[PDB]
């Protein structure tokens, strides 16, 4: 609307300037301000560029002065608003740590409908994670998601307005899969692990434990991780 009214004001100012400059037969001219020349002078004045001619009559100079003031205000407003836009975009910082996510509230975030994540959130004593669990508990609409597939689909559709919380392994797997739209960001909130499980009181426990430790020290475990998380 501002641009529309600027064009209308330009047309009106040019027409009025031409009229007040050439309508009087007693000034017949002493001024080279035709309709085309009036339009040219107005266009030059708006762009704050040097004009070849300037009005000499009282009405012409009044029109020129008010057009100059309008042009100054509009150009300064445009520069100031563009500076504000650029500064606001520059100040925008994504979220890395979970604390930054906790302080912020623009982007929604929630965990699965069930699982050990819920128990970790509830039983935690960290102030950040406590307020996190309160925020999920009291939130509308339900950030809670039935399954992991629905969670990743929702995160993909929400175009950054949603965040998901899940195992780092599955998160890395989803990151390394097409179409490469999601990223794991930050550090692991807690510590867990996957271990080989054997029946109580079995002869297979001690040497499987020795085997997995030897495998980790030999580094082949990291090779398997890289091989199917990044290589494939």
């Amino acid at each position: 609307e501002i641009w529309m009214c600027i064009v209308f004001a330009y047309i009106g100012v040019s027409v009025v300037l031409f009229l007040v400059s050439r309508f009087s037969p007693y000034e017949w001219s002493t001024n080279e301000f035709g309709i085309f020349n009036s339009l040219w002078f107005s266009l030059g004045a708006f762009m704050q560029q040097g004009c070849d001619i300037s009005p000499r009559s009282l009405s012409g100079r009044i029109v020129g002065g008010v057009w100059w003031f309008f042009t100054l205000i509009i150009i300064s407003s445009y520069t100031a608003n563009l500076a504000a836009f650029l500064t606001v975009e520059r100040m925008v910082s994504p979220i890395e740590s979970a604390e930054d996510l906790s302080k912020q509230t623009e982007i929604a975030y929630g965990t699965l409908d069930s699982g050990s994540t819920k128990e970790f959130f509830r039983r935690s004593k960290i102030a950040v994670f406590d307020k996190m669990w309160t925020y999920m508990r009291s939130a509308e609409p339900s950030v809670f998601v039935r399954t992991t597939a629905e969670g990743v689909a929702r995160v993909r559709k929400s175009k950054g307005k949603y965040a998901y919380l899940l195992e780092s392994t599955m998160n890395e797997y989803i990151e390394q899969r097409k179409p490469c739209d999601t990223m794991k960001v930050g550090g692991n909130l807690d510590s867990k692990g996957y271990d080989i499980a054997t029946p109580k009181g079995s002869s297979l426990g001690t040497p499987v434990n020795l085997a997995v430790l030897k495998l980790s020290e030999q580094g082949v475990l990291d090779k398997l991780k890289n091989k199917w998380w990044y290589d494939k």
């Binding site: 609307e1 501002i2 009025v16 009559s57 009405s59 009044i62 309008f70």
Partner: protein, 45 residues
Amino acid sequence: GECTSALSLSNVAGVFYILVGGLGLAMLVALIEFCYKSRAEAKRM
């Protein structure tokens, strides 16, 4: 407890009003000058 935009025409409406007022004032001045000069010419002739 559970608890920049583009400049609009209203932000610069005053300068538009001032511009139109200046245009009208210049027009009135020009018309008065024309009428006065026509009256002077008629008095001369």
